[PDB]
Symmetry: C2
């Protein structure tokens, strides 16, 4: 790949000092950052290279650009196979008849639990070709929005199809498997066990074996539990044993909804964080999704364990979640020194990206505390890069522009009205820009997106295979009639 100097822009590093450099530069050799700082300081690193390396150095003039570390979306679900349902493409254009459903109104816990237990049967119904075409397009949308490292916390897709998608696209991916072995059946006053814990844990072991073979360093894996509602004691302890043995991170959704604690006490006899604590899962390895509905003891367990919270303040309103303001626990735990990162959660059609989530945190944390300094723009960036990489246990290699780390970075144009005269283009980016304003995406020194276009992939072809795969999956497996699907596909703007 050789050496490149990216010079002249404002450079955000998201290093320990959250360093920003006006007229900064980044020097990369092959897959790694070697120098980053003021342009003159970096130019000295250039004149210190082996003369052979310096001979083929490529200069990128970024003087009309902002440079960011690649986004690390550590809490994501591939759900594009469900695009053609009454959460997506089949809805009437009018939203007036919409109802509080699913996650809304505190959470319909029976429906959420029953829904999650059905994923295994639908993943099974999917062809490898459908899986790969849907995964590839879904993951392209993440990449297009500046996500260079993506974290699977449970997808309706085939794990090895998602690994193949990451490999073809050139991005980094923490692969997972679906884990559900319990359901909250309304005809019972105790959890119904739905699967052998050993089978669920064997699926993840098989994925871990396959990713171990990968030589690129771009593929890792992390076991998840779908949701603590759908987790037996045997699955929780099996997960604790598996992450200790293989030295892995661990992720689940816990304290996510108002109605969760009550359903957890009724069906399992104990709240989410306490059941994880009893299995030994509340430690530095834990990424807890949402994690807002925590009492005093559960908050103290997370803080003592130096656990990690992934927060999705961009997504809550449209799902009817209340995981920011109803408790205010996640901002309080961040203030008390808990690691808190920003993530986009699940989407069956494109929803808020990392850029949109960064804006949401900036506006929403600061409004609740009447304090424009609680989340600075650089904090929002750190929360979407270095701090997310830490929660994913990938901060050895990604999440900041420092010497020795991977050359994963974004260029954003700053030459329009939105940015004019602002010495803080990241602030203009949070006010008035988002995912589609990502211009260039580089992963380990390779240009994957440029001018907001795929460089080595045909996004028109990725789209057409996705639509073909989605048609097959939607008509066959979801039994949606062709009369509802084919008209919508016919009016897709080619």
């Amino acid at each position: 790949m050789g050496a490149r100097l990216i010079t002249g822009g404002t450079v955000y590093t998201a290093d320990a000092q959250e360093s920003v450099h006006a007229r900064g530069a980044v020097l990369t050799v092959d897959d790694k950052v070697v120098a980053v700082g003021p342009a003159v300081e970096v130019e000295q690193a250039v004149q210190a290279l082996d003369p052979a390396v310096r001979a083929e150095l490529r200069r990128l003039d970024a003087s009309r650009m902002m440079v960011l570390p690649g986004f690390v979306n550590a809490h994501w679900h591939e759900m594009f196979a469900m695009g053609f349902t009454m959460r997506g493409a089949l809805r009437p254009p009018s939203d007036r008849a919409d109802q509080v459903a699913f996650m809304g109104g505190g959470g319909d816990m029976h429906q959420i639990s029953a829904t999650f237990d059905r994923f295994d049967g639908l993943i099974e119904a999917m062809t490898e070709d459908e899986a790969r075409a849907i995964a590839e397009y879904s993951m392209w949308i993440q990449l297009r929005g500046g996500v260079t490292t993506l974290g699977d916390m449970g997808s309706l897709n085939r794990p090895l199809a998602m690994v193949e998608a990451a490999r073809r696209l050139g991005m980094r991916f923490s692969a997972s498997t679906w884990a559900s072995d319990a359901v909250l059946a309304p005809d019972r006053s105790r959890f119904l066990r739905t699967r052998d814990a050993d089978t669920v844990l064997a699926s993840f072991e098989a994925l871990l074996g396959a990713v171990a073979a990968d030589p690129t360093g771009r593929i890792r894996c992390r076991p998840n539990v779908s949701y603590v509602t759908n987790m037996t004691d045997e699955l929780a302890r099996g997960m604790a044993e598996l992450v200790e043995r293989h030295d892995l991170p661990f992720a689940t959704h816990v304290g996510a909804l108002r109605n969760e604690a009550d359903a957890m006490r009724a069906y399992h006899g104990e709240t989410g964080v306490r059941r994880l604590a009893e299995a030994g899962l509340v430690d530095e390895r834990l990424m807890a999704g949402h994690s807002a509905f925590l009492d005093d003891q559960e908050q103290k367990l997370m803080l003592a364990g130096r656990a990690h919270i992934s927060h999705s303040p961009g997504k809550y309103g449209p799902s009817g979640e209340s995981a920011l303001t109803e408790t205010g626990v996640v901002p309080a735990l961040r203030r008390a020194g808990l690691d808190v990162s920003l993530s986009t959660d699940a989407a069956a059609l494109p929803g808020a990206g990392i850029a949109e989530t960064m804006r949401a945190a900036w506006q929403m944390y600061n409004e609740m505390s009447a304090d424009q300094t609680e989340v600075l723009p650089t904090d929002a960036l750190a929360m979407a890069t270095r701090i997310a990489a830490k929660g994913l246990r990938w901060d050895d290699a990604v999440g900041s522009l420092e010497p020795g780390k991977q050359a994963d970075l974004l260029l954003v144009r700053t030459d329009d009205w939105r940015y004019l005269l602002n010495p803080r283009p990241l602030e203009s980016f949070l006010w008035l820009a988002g995912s589609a304003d990502v211009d260039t995406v580089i992963v380990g020194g390779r240009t994957l997106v440029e001018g907001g276009r795929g460089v080595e992939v045909d996004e028109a072809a990725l789209r057409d295979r996705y639509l073909q795969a989605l048609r097959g999956f939607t008509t066959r497996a979801l039994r949606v009639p062709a009369e509802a699907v084919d008209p919508v596909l016919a009016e897709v703007a080619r």
Copy 2:
């Protein structure tokens, strides 16, 4: 401009009384008015019913790869681009690490807010007529570029007639105002100073009203504001009540905006802001109250009983350190109780959240606080930025919805990229993943002003460069910022 236009095939959001949405809908316009709106095939019947002369010169715009919205009505805005080259804007270090809670943050520094607002008159006088017009036209262009077709001044650091001229040149609609402060809180004196004759402040608004009446385009109205209830004597409040009754006008102010406001109002004026307004007879259907979140039960009941209007800016509270959404939850609660609530951008000295960003904010933030994805539907957020804002501005006679007899003010947004694919609700995708810059076409009174994201009736490079020269002149001569601090920033501008 004159002539007939059929905009057909896109998804059309009307923001009419039913919040109607038409997939493969159409808008037929003749001269400056909407004549028909609905399903393509039904509008095509209205086309076949036109005078053959009119039909002959019809221009058909294929909008099949677009979303059609009403023009955004930003009814609560301040022109502050003259202050771009201060420590709120261009002179800040790139690093944010040393930023402090200031001004409206931490519940509000009421003395500094009051003192700052009372200095506007002096700084406006320090501005050349050319600087005023150049900064106004660039500031107002930034609004228009993001889809704002009707803009409401609620008190600006600019010359009113410069802003009227800017609106006139740009082709957009403008509710002009004057700056109105006749009191300052002076902690050193244990009282408010009465800094101006209420009757002179009112006579300045009467003179603006005379000048706007001479504008023949129908695009310029005016509305008196009070800067802030801290800076308002009883005599200014009563004079405002008399003026808006005599001329049948709307009225606007900031009230119940900050945690520390109520204590400062009781100490300096005896009474909280909504109570002082109600005593002057200003809490009625004419009132647009900016922020209006720190209200007790009696104040909330006064607003409801008067059918007053609240303009909310949930896009910009966090970055200002304001807490006018969650600390009280009063504005969402008043909306649920039937008060008209609209969405606005407020003040910016450099580009900040536009209407499109504020719609997203309302959709996320109101729905999260109530654990309810239906409290603010995407079509509600649109209504709050169009029809409801028009109603609060008293311009809903002509703007805010795509209905027959209203002005042909509309936006086209392209829906053909990845963000919109397969979504029968392109407005939802727009709130998820788009913003001000994704406005493609802006039509006001049937005239295209923006197309493909570019101004077609202005020189965008001229608006920018004249704004930069004006700001240099104002910054160095009036604000006394040295050339040595200004020219390096201006030298870095990407031309």
